[PDB]
Design a protein around this ligand. Structure first.
Ligand SMILES: [Ca+2]
Ligand SMILES: [Cl-]
Ligand SMILES: [Cl-]
Length: 294
């Protein structure tokens, strides 16, 4: 069902001198849910229940997001993809995930998860993905209605938009969910970002990291690497397509539709499709996992 209540209890662990927050419920091989910008583990709260009894249900808060510690000192050079990856790699190492992991990814969680899977292919039993960065992008491949705003994020105007005015949380997030969010739901999403300034840096650093037209070069290369790998990997996949969808449409969807050993379903939603179709998404993931774990 829908609902504003989080799934399970937030747990905390020290990683590289910072406390990171995560949900970890049940036993067995992990089903690892990874949020992106500007969300947290909370994104998966109505989806994870569908996987009850199918394994160890884990959802981590990326550094500086959800209930994880902020970087200190934060600034324009902090919260890059590389920095997030260092923290997340270390957290996933600390969690003792074993060698039959099912990844469930969205948004920046997909760039991070796809890359981790490429670097740990023997440990990945399956990958479920939705509204994901499936390859390096050109401006044409980026949603037309968001070009101006994201170009502004990736300019000097970004600090006022995001650090001062919290545009990613307050405008982009509900703007890309079809159903109206409740007071409690928005409260959960804005909680890590209540204070103006550096507390909101992760939500600005992320759009500045999107591999678009060759920039930034490091993330472009990482996405190029996982795009090539995923297009060849026989690891079972679940592509949750969305209608109308948002990011994973056009060329980037045409591309991920070439990936081998892939099941696809379509659900209602724009970008943050977890808020529109959590039960359809959860049921699909549960069926995927059941087939992977007979
Ligand atoms: Ca909306
Ligand atoms: Cl095992
Ligand atoms: Cl972003």
């Amino acid at each position: 069902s829908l609902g504003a209540k989080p799934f399970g209890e937030k747990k905390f662990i020290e990683i590289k001198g910072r406390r990171m927050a995560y949900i970890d419920e049940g036993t067995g091989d992990p089903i690892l849910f990874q949020h992106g910008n500007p969300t947290s583990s909370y994104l998966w709260r109505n989806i994870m229940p569908h996987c009850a009894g199918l394994g160890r249900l884990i959802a981590c808060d990326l550094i500086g997001m959800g209930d994880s510690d902020k970087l200190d000192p934060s600034g324009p050079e902090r919260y890059t993809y590389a920095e997030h990856r260092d923290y997340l790699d270390a957290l996933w190492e600390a969690l003792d995930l074993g060698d039959r992991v099912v990844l469930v990814v969205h948004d920046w969680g997909s760039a991070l998860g796809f890359d981790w899977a490429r670097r740990h292919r023997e440990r990945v039993q399956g990958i479920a993905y939705m509204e994901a960065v499936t390859m390096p992008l050109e401006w044409a491949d980026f949603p037309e209605q968001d070009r101006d705003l994201f170009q502004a994020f990736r300019s000097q105007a970004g600090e006022e938009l995001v650090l001062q005015d919290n545009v990613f949380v307050e405008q982009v997030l509900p703007g890309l969910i079809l159903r109206p969010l409740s007071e409690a739901e928005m409260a959960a999403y804005r909680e890590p970002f209540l204070a103006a300034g550096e507390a909101r840096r992760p939500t600005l650093s992320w759009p500045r990291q999107i591999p678009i037209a060759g920039t930034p070069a490091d993330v472009v290369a990482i996405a190029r690497d996982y795009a090539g790998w995923l297009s060849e990997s026989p690891i079972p996949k679940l592509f949750i397509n969305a209608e109308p969808g948002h990011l994973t449409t056009g060329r980037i969807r045409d591309f991920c539709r070439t990936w081998p050993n892939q099941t696809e379903i379509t659900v209602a939603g724009a970008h943050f499709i977890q808020e529109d179709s959590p039960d359809e998404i959860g049921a699909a993931i549960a069926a995927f996992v059941r087939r992977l774990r007979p």
